[PDB]
Amino acid sequence: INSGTTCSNDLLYSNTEVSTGVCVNYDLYGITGQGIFKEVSAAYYNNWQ
Amino acid sequence: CGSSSRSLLEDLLFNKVKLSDVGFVEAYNNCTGGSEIRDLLCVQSFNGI
Ligand SMILES: *[C@@H]1O[C@H](CO)[C@@H](O)[C@H](O)[C@H]1NC(C)=O
């Protein structure tokens, strides 16, 4: 009860609601900041980066 | 003729130099959207410098 390795709804929303083209605040993958999402096509990223 | 008159040796001097006092204005204008990937002067300008 109330202590352990099996967590229930303690994690936040984690929504798929990317707001493109506007200035927002973000924390994705660990990095906090204030900026912009903007869609583009590029392919030097890998499936682990 | 019009008051936008450099000279030819002034052109050779003033084409190898990226950040003169007109490149700064035309790069600071380019901070609304990034529009290629990013710039460094926009990261400076949004941080007070
Ligand atoms: C400003 O942006 C436009 C399009 O985004 C580009 O064609 C131009 O070369 C840029 N100028 C500078 C000085 O970055």
Side-chain angles (χ1 to χ4, degrees), chain B:
Chain B
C1 191
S3 59
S4 179
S5 316
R6 289 180 183 162
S7 296
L8 193 65
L9 217 132
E10 296 197 29
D11 275 13
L12 265 63
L13 285 174
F14 267 108
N15 281 25
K16 315 190 181 307
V17 181
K18 171 77 177 188
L19 300 183
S20 57
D21 69 318
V22 58
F24 259 115
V25 184
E26 72 163 324
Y28 276 139
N29 288 321
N30 259 1
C31 291
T32 70
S35 174
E36 175 208 51
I37 158 181
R38 213 142 119 122
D39 204 337
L40 195 61
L41 300 186
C42 305
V43 190
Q44 286 178 28
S45 149
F46 297 151
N47 286 271
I49 316 163

Side-chain angles (χ1 to χ4, degrees), chain A residues 36 38 40 44, chain B residues 33 35-37:
Chain A
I36 289 174
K38 173 246 169 57
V40 84
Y44 33 63
Chain B
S35 174
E36 175 208 51
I37 158 181

